[PDB]
């Protein structure tokens, strides 16, 4: 009856392992709970893609834009301060009759704060388009990008 | 005969109980699975990260001796991106402006000379500087990786001696 | 017959249990396992380049050669070899022909 | 009693190995899909490619935006892909050997779903 | 390239590939077109090896081309950590370490640092730096399963150096149970189950 | 009894139904070969330092069809009168590839 | 016949348990409702 | 002075540090192991 | 003003301690730096993925009946 | 014999206990090595 | 082994301090000045110690809550160090440290088995 003995010993091993595990868990549940609570970030690392963690909830326009000239930058407009520019044109402001006029800033920091603020404040003033065209501003924009 | 059927039914009952245990979102089941997953990673990475963090705290204490502006944010160019870094005033470790609950805010550069990325990084320094992430122990305790043994990374040694 | 059918059923049982116990069954597990596998591959490839100090015959000019002790750091994820020689780091791109032609004599004349 | 043993083995197989595997898979992937849908973006830029996801009874499935030539759309057009409702897409399930680095991209698309799980 | 015949073609051929041994040999001729072409090349790619060779070739006779290249590169790349000797990141003080003041920041006057990152006027004062202190340099340290300590107490005085702070005892002595209790409970419950099964049978 | 065999068959059928419904794709991606990770040093494995008269050359580079001179630190082609003697002293008469160096 | 009856009772109970615990995650009606 | 914060202004009782390290550390239960081994051997030979 | 310039140091299964004492009346100190090892004891928990298999073990008792 | 089966069951229980204890030692071998690397000086010392 | 050794530390300390208290009982005979603070030279420092009135173990002037005071000397002849030790004797003599069990309970070591230390060197030299 060797097979019966083997079955008995393996089933006893299973039951005894269950009892050992139950006793150890009963006496160490709080311990492993504190261990998990203090090591919660060790369960799954945030680099499952092999790349650093990225919070998709936080928006960034630099992630997708692949052409530099599409981006908005603060550039010194000589004799008149700092202006925000891109290949689309300049950040503009409304005139008395809904016109587009170049929005000028006193300091670099103010221009940066206006340009990169998450508030929708984009007003394109292309100096090379048919409605409002002039050679000086178009050449400056071409030379500053 | 009858004992065989009784044992059969008992095994089915224990299987149903284990089904309950596994698929009922139990606290004990969850803690045990979490514990296995957490324990392996702790064994893998905790000592490496602690030793490396102590060594880089030593290196940052040596580096900050004399310098006064080493503890303010500067936009550092890492080739493909910008990071608003500084030296932590307490642990003397590299610190960066964090993006939400993820890693540092890496401002991508579309070309080699990207002014817009520089300026957005400056905007982060002036505005979003309240959320910061430090290499090593803090990065391991918050993100699960320390950044020292991952490349390319702004904490890794290869990306910094390159 | 009956014994063959029972054995086939038991082996099918053992195979399916083995797959569901030791192989990924959802996208989280599959992603974790592939991260671990790729990391192991990268670490092995990095360790192929000898990290310890090694003796090389380095040509400092066209017709001058010196025996020098160098250190090498290989990063195969980005494909770059940093050689510390005489206390200075030289970065060789493994996708650059000239960097290849400069680094290969150093690596091959090593011992 | 070999057949009773087989009944026991397969009952345990199903209800203690397979069904818990289904439960973990569904919990993790439904949570990932909910976190995705909370972004309120139809396509996201993963590994320089635009990926969207859907939930079916078999789990979550990723697909990549492609143009009329079955060439993946770069993220530079992400906005004009999100506004578009008739984007040609290729599912990551069927292996495509014509697209370079498709397997790695689909890998990373699945991998960044689990930033919270 | 001993004559000015190939200058016009090589001007563009070497912008295509600046690391070419033939382009570098064309630059070794040290004529104005070659040095100006490489000043233009290195004002954009100063972080490349051929720019190291270019700076080696020109200096000290024609350092001006490398200086103009470095100025352009380090005003474009403000965030590069290698431009923080020539272009200090502080807003109002970029010329902080220009000239003999290069010695005042000992990471600029370093032998592990490429001298394409210093202006020539900074580079010539790198050999006159006067340093007082206690420096320990280790070329390499391959340590396996071995803790190392490298301390340099530079004061002439014998300081009142005490003991290293041990830390804080985070672990709390939770009330435990006798170590034999698990084995005793397991054996007792197994024996009781067996006895009950035997009696019932 | 045939009823118990039918029960086992029903259990196998339910296993296959569950596997087909929920784990079809995971099993489809099971016989396929693993993803290939590019090796930047794989194309340099056959490179060996041959010598042509006094000029040190690099062989074994497939994409560079013409024989390519070995460059020095300052990117200057290597010319050495004792090229053959230096090569023989470094490794021996038998040629050495980069694979052999990496496998030391 | 007792084995068959007991096996079906346990299979039905376990399927009911699994269905009750897994309906919130496999029933995609809520996801289809949300647009 | 680089690691000045590494040292202690107050004296350190390093014996108590070592004693806590010994107290809160893994207990190789050689007493239990030896008793279990002797019981196993006696059961295997004498009892069975 | 005194400088130590070590070379390629390599130590294994050992301990190193470099002190820049250039005959400055600094007594040779071999003070062992003890710390609070805040060790977490791992518990003998088998991966509960074993729970189905163990049940199968008990199940094979039905063969002995 | 019933008593022989009881002794076999108890032997299996004791050997399972021994395996669990050896597994406990195995899981804590990194802790053991850390303790030893920190406290190897006091292996033979007569004082701190 | 490490665990057993650190366990034995206490018993070894108790044995050594009993032996050295016996030796101090033997040594203190007809020399009353031994029971008064004296500034002793240790080559590199001065310590103001005596023999304890009760336990007959070495007892020196303490420094704060740490070990005995050590007036470091910058040469063989240091009049300022000795005069400061005299100042400690005449003013800051209220706080003292005794070798043996008291030092074990306060600072974790008994002074013995430690080289160099004032307890063992003073006992050996005398």
Q: Which two tokens stand for residue A26?
A: 């009963």
Please answer whether residues J40 and I33 qualify as being in contact, where contact means their C-beta atoms are separated by less than 8 angstroms.
no
CA angle centred on D22, ends D18 and D23, rounded to 5°: 115
Which residues are registered as beta bridge partners of B81?
Answer: B108
C51 CB neighbours in chain E (<8 A) are 142
Please answer whether residues G3 and D11 qualify as being in contact, where contact means their C-beta atoms are separated by less than 8 angstroms.
no
Residue A41 and residue B103: Cα distance in Å, rounded?
A: 13
Neighbours of B54 (CB within 10 A): 15
CA angle centred on B159, ends A67 and E80, rounded to 5°: 60
Name chain D's partners: 3 or more CB pairs within 8 A: A, B, C, F, G, I
| Residue in K58, K35, K32, K54 with CA at minimum distance from that of residue K112 | K58
Q: Which two tokens stand for residue B156?
A: 């890794």
Q: Do H3 and B65 touch (CB under 8 A)?
A: no
Please answer whether residues J32 and I37 qualify as being in contact, where contact means their C-beta atoms are separated by less than 8 angstroms.
no
Q: Do D17 and I56 touch (CB under 8 A)?
A: no
Strands, E assignment, chain K: 38-41, 45-51, 58-61, 71-72, 96-98
Q: Is A32's Cβ below 8 Å from some Cβ in I? A: yes
Phi, psi for I22 (deg, rounded to 5): -95, 60
Q: Which two tokens stand for residue C108?
A: 């091959």
E177 CB neighbours in chain A (<8 A) are 27
Q: Is K72 helix (H, G, I), strand (E, B) or coil?
A: strand
How do beta strands I15-19 and E147-151 pair? parallel
Q: Do chains I and H touch (3 or more CB pairs under 8 A)?
A: yes
Residue C30 and residue D107: Cα distance in Å, rounded?
A: 9
Q: Write the residue in A11, A31, A32 that is nearest to I61 by C-beta.
A: A11
| Residue in F63, E116, E50, F45 with CA at minimum distance from that of residue C98 | E50
Phi, psi for K93 (deg, rounded to 5): -105, 0
Q: Do E180 and H24 touch (CB under 8 A)?
A: no
F7 CB neighbours in chain D (<8 A) are 3, 7
Q: Write the residue in A12, A15, A20 that is nearest to E182 by C-beta.
A: A20
Residue A26 and residue A30: Cα distance in Å, rounded?
A: 9
Q: For residue B87, give Cα distances in angstroms to B119, B152, F68.
A: 21, 20, 47
- Enter the resolution in angstroms: 3.0
Q: Determine if the peptide bond prior to A98 is cis (ω within 30°).
A: no
Q: Which two tokens stand for residue E30?
A: 């040290």
Q: Do C27 and D113 touch (CB under 8 A)?
A: yes
What residue of I is the nearest CA neighbor of B39? I42
Q: Write the residue in A5, A12, A24 that is nearest to J13 by C-beta.
A: A12
Which strands, in side-by-side order, build the sheet including C66-75? C54-58, C66-75, C80-85, C88-93
Q: Do K109 and J40 touch (CB under 8 A)?
A: no
DSSP one-letter string for chain B:
-HHHHHHHHHHHHHHHHHHHHHHTT-HHHHHHHHHHHHHHHHHHHHHHHHHHHHHHHHHHHHHTSS-SSTTS-EEEE-SSEEEEEEE-TTT--EEEEB-TTSSB--EE-SSSS-HHHHHHHHHHHHHSTTSEEETTHHHHHHHS--STTSSS-SSSSHHHH-
3-state SS of chain I is CCCEEEEEEEEECCEEEEECCCCCCCCCCCCCCCCCCCCCCCCCCCCCCHHHHHHHHHHCHHHHC
Residue F68 and residue B124: Cα distance in Å, rounded?
A: 49
Residue A45 and residue B37: Cα distance in Å, rounded?
A: 10
Q: Write the residue in D6, D14, D58 that is nearest to F21 by C-beta.
A: D58
Cα C68 vs. chain centroid, distance in angstroms?
26
Residue D6 and residue F15: Cα distance in Å, rounded?
A: 13
Q: Which of A56, A57, A67 to mutate to test the interface with D (most CBs of D within 10 A)?
A: A56
Name chain G's partners: 3 or more CB pairs within 8 A: B, D, F
Q: Do D20 and B102 touch (CB under 8 A)?
A: no
Q: From the CA of J21, how many Å to the nearest CA of chain I?
A: 8
Q: Do J47 and K112 touch (CB under 8 A)?
A: yes
Helix axes H30-42, J2-27, angle to 10 degrees: 150
Residues of D with CB under 8 A from a CB of F: 3-4, 6-7, 10-11, 13-14, 18-19, 21-22, 25, 57-59, 93, 95, 103-104, 107
Neighbours of E43 (CB within 10 A): 20
Name chain A's partners: 3 or more CB pairs within 8 A: B, C, D, E, I, J
D57 CB neighbours in chain G (<8 A) are 26, 28
Question: Please, which experimental method was used?
Answer: cryo-EM
A12 CB neighbours in chain J (<8 A) are 8-9, 12-13, 16
A29: left (phi over 0), alpha (psi -120 to 50) or beta: alpha
What single DSSP character describes residue K30?
S
Whose tokens are 């924009």? That residue is A141
Residue C49 and residue C56: Cα distance in Å, rounded?
A: 14
What residue of B is the nearest CA neighbor of A44? B144
Q: Do I35 and J23 touch (CB under 8 A)?
A: no
Which strands, in side-by-side order, build the sheet including F68-69? F51-52, F55-58, F68-69
Q: Do chains I and A touch (3 or more CB pairs under 8 A)?
A: yes
Q: Do E168 and I36 touch (CB under 8 A)?
A: yes
CB-count burial class (<10 Å; 0-12, 13-18, 19+) for E138 = middle
Q: From the CA of B49, how many Å to the nearest CA of chain C?
A: 17
Q: Do chains E and C touch (3 or more CB pairs under 8 A)?
A: yes
Residue F61 and residue C94: Cα distance in Å, rounded?
A: 13
Q: Determine if the peptide bond prior to F48 is cis (ω within 30°).
A: no
Q: From the CA of H38, how many Å to the nearest CA of chain E?
A: 14
Q: From the CA of B33, how many Å to the nearest CA of chain D?
A: 11
Write out residues 43-82 of C within 8 Å (CB-CB) of B.
73, 75, 77-78, 80, 82
Name chain K's partners: 3 or more CB pairs within 8 A: H, I, J
CB-count burial class (<10 Å; 0-12, 13-18, 19+) for C34 = buried
Q: Which two tokens stand for residue C52?
A: 């310890």
User: Widest CA span of chain I, in angstroms?
Assistant: 88
| Residue in E23, F74, E52 with CA at minimum distance from that of residue C101 | F74
Whose tokens are 């430690």? That residue is K114
Q: Is K38 helix (H, G, I), strand (E, B) or coil?
A: strand
Q: Do chains G and C touch (3 or more CB pairs under 8 A)?
A: no
**Sign of the dihedral through C-alpha D26, D27, D28, D34:** positive
Q: Determine if the peptide bond prior to K116 is cis (ω within 30°).
A: yes
Q: Do A23 and E177 touch (CB under 8 A)?
A: no
Cα end-to-end span (Å), chain A = 90
Name chain J's partners: 3 or more CB pairs within 8 A: A, B, E, H, I, K
Residue A91 and residue B116: Cα distance in Å, rounded?
A: 14
Q: Do chains F and J touch (3 or more CB pairs under 8 A)?
A: no
CA dihedral K52, K56, K57, K59 (to 10 degrees): 10
Write out residues 15-34 of H within 8 Å (CB-CB) of J.
15, 18, 21, 25-26, 28-29, 32-33
CB-count burial class (<10 Å; 0-12, 13-18, 19+) for I9 = middle
b/e map of C66-85 (b: 16 or more CB within 10 Å)? eebbbbbbbbbbebbbbbbb
User: Widest CA span of chain C, in angstroms?
Assistant: 83
Rg (CA), chain D: 19
What residue of I is the nearest CA neighbor of D21? I49
| Residue in K51, K76, K16, K73 with CA at minimum distance from that of residue K126 | K51
Q: Write the residue in H15, H28, H48 that is nearest to J48 by C-beta.
A: H15
Residue C20 and residue C11: Cα distance in Å, rounded?
A: 14
Q: Which two tokens stand for residue C15?
A: 């195979």
What single DSSP character describes residue K56?
-
Residue D39 and residue D53: Cα distance in Å, rounded?
A: 12
Residue E62 makes CB contacts below 8 A (sequence gap 6+) with E30, E35
3-state SS of chain F is CHHHHHHHHHHHHHHHHHHHHHCHHHHHCCCCCCCCCCCCCHHHCCCECCEECCEEEEECCCCCCCCEECECCCCCECECCCHHHHHHHHCCCCCCEHHHHHCC
Helix axes E21-28, E32-42, angle to 10 degrees: 130
Cα A144 vs. chain centroid, distance in angstroms?
28
Q: Is C54 helix (H, G, I), strand (E, B) or coil?
A: strand
Q: Which two tokens stand for residue K2?
A: 């490490």
F25 CB neighbours in chain D (<8 A) are 58-59, 93
Q: Which two tokens stand for residue F31?
A: 């016989």
């Amino acid at each position: 009856n060797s097979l019966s003995i083997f079955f008995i010993v393996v089933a006893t091993a299973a039951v005894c392992l269950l009892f050992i595990q139950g006793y150890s868990i009963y006496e160490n549940y709080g311990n492993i709970k504190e261990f998990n609570a203090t090591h919660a970030a060790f369960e799954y690392s945030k680099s499952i893609g092999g790349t650093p963690a990225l919070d998709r909830r936080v928006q960034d326009v630099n992630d997708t834009i692949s052409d530099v000239k599409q981006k908005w930058r603060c550039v010194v407009y000589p004799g008149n301060g700092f202006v925000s520019a891109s290949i689309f044109g300049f950040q503009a402001e409304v005139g008395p009759n809904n016109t587009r006029s170049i929005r000028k800033f006193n300091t670099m920091q103010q221009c940066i704060d206006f340009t990169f603020s998450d508030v929708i404040n984009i007003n394109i003033y292309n100096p090379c388009v048919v409605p409002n065209i002039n050679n000086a501003e178009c050449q400056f924009l071409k030379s500053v990008l | 005969k009858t004992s065989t059927l009784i044992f059969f039914v008992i095994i089915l009952a224990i299987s149903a109980l284990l089904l309950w245990f596994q698929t009922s979102d139990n606290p004990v089941f969850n803690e045990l699975t979490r514990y296995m997953r957490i324990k392996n990673t702790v064994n893998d990475w905790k000592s490496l990260t602690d030793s490396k963090t102590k060594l880089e705290s030593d290196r940052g204490r040596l580096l900050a001796a004399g310098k006064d502006d080493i503890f303010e944010f500067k936009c550092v160019d890492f080739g493909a991106y910008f990071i608003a870094m500084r030296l932590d005033k307490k642990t003397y470790l590299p610190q960066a402006i964090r993006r939400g609950t993820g890693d540092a805010w890496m401002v991508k550069k579309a070309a080699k000379v990207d002014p817009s990325a520089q300026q957005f990084c400056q905007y982060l320094i002036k505005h979003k500087s309240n959320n910061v992430i430090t290499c090593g122990n803090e990065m391991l305790n918050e993100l699960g990786y320390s950044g020292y043994f991952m490349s390319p990374h702004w904490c890794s040694d290869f990306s910094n001696m390159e | 017959m009956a014994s063959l059918l029972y054995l086939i059923l038991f082996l099918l049982f053992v195979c399916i249990s083995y797959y569901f116990t030791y192989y990924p069954t959802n996208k989280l597990q599959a992603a974790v396992m592939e991260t671990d596998r790729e990391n192991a591959i990268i670490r092995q490839r990095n360790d192929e380049i000898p990290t310890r100090t090694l003796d090389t015959a380095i040509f400092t000019d066209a017709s001058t050669v010196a025996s020098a002790q160098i250190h090498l750091y290989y990063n195969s994820n980005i494909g770059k070899i940093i050689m510390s020689l005489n206390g200075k780091k030289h970065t060789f791109n493994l996708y650059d022909d000239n960097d290849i032609r400069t680094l290969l004599p150093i690596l091959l004349l090593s011992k | 009693m070999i057949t009773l043993f087989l009944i026991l083995c397969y009952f345990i197989l199903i209800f203690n190995i397979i069904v818990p595997a289904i439960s973990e898979k569904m919990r993790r992937e439904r949570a990932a899909y909910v976190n995705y849908k909370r972004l309120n973006k139809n396509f996201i830029c993963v590994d320089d490619r635009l990926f969207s996801y859907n939930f079916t009874t078999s789990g979550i499935k990723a697909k990549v935006a492609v143009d009329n030539k079955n060439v993946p759309i770069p993220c530079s057009k992400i906005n004009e892909v999100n506004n578009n409702k008739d984007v040609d897409t290729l599912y990551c399930d069927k292996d495509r050997d014509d697209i370079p680095g498709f397997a790695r991209s689909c890998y990373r698309a699945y991998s960044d779903l689990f930033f919270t799980t | 390239y001993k004559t000015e015949h190939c200058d016009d073609f090589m001007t563009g051929f070497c912008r295509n590939d600046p690391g070419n041994p033939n382009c570098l040999e064309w630059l070794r001729a040290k004529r104005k077109p070659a040095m100006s072409t490489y000043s233009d090349i290195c004002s954009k790619h100063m972080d490349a090896r051929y720019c190291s060779e270019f700076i080696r070739i020109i200096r000290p006779d024609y350092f001006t081309f490398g200086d103009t290249a470095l100025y352009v590169f380090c005003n474009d790349h403000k965030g590069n950590r290698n431009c923080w000797c020539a272009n200090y990141p502080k807003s109002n003080s970029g010329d902080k370490y220009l000239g003999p003041r290069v010695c005042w920041l000992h990471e600029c006057t370093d032998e592990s640092r490429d001298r394409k990152w210093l202006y020539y006027n900074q580079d010539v004062q790198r050999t006159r730096c006067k340093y007082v202190g206690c420096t320990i340099n280790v070329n390499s340290l391959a340590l396996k399963n071995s803790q190392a300590e490298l301390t340099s107490n530079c004061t002439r005085t014998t300081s009142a150096v005490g003991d290293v702070h041990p830390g804080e005892p985070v672990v709390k002595d939770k009330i435990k149970l006798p170590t034999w209790l698990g084995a005793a409970i397991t054996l007792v419950v197994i024996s009781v189950i067996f006895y009950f099964i035997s009696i019932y049978s | 009894v045939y009823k118990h065999r039918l029960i086992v068959l029903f259990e196998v059928f339910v296993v296959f139904i569950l596997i087909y419904v929920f784990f079809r794709s995971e099993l489809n991606m099971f016989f396929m070969p693993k993803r290939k990770i590019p090796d930047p040093i794989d194309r340099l494995r056959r490179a060996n330092l041959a010598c042509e008269d006094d000029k040190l050359m690099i062989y074994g580079l497939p994409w560079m069809t013409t024989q390519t001179s070995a460059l020095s630190i300052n990117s200057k082609p290597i010319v050495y009168k004792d090229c053959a003697k230096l090569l023989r002293s470094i490794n021996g008469s038998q040629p050495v590839s980069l694979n052999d160096v990496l496998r030391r | 016949m007792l084995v068959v009856i007991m096996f079906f009772i346990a299979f039905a109970f376990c399927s009911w348990l699994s269905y009750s615990y897994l309906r919130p995650y496999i029933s995609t009606k809520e996801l289809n409702k949300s647009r | 002075l680089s690691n000045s914060d590494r040292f202690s202004t107050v004296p350190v009782n390093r014996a108590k540090v070592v004693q806590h390290n010994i107290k809160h550390s893994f207990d190789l239960k050689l007493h239990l192991i030896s008793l279990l081994s002797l019981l196993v051997i006696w059961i295997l030979i004498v009892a069975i | 003003d005194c400088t130590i310039s070590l070379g390629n140091v390599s130590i294994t299964d050992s301990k190193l301690d470099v002190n820049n004492v250039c005959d400055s009346k600094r007594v040779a100190t071999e003070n062992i730096a003890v710390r609070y090892l805040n060790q977490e004891i791992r518990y003998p928990i088998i991966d509960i993925k074993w729970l189905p298999i163990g049940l199968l073990a008990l199940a094979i008792l039905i063969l002995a009946f």
